[PDB]
Amino acid sequence: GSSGSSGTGERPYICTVCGKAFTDRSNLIKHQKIHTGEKPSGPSSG
């Protein structure tokens, strides 16, 4: 296998949509931009 991370330790904020973690709240909010904005105003139905 192959997994490289800062090491041990968890985060306070965690995207309750995909399953991602974030140290700073702001950072998290910026990430949601992917769940709130994925496709433009078109025939798409989410």
The residues that touch Zn ion, with contacts defined as CB under 5 A, are 15, 17-18, 20
Which residue, 7 or 31, has its beta carbon nearer to Zn ion? 31
Which residue, 18 or 29, has its beta carbon nearer to Zn ion? 18
Instruction: For residues 4 and 26, give the distance between their C-alpha atoms in angstroms, rounded to a whole number.
Output: 24
**Distance of closest approach, residue 29 Cβ to Zn ion, in angstroms:** 11
**Distance of closest approach, residue 37 Cβ to Zn ion, in angstroms:** 12
Instruction: For residues 38 and 45, give the distance between their C-alpha atoms in angstroms, rounded to a whole number.
Output: 11
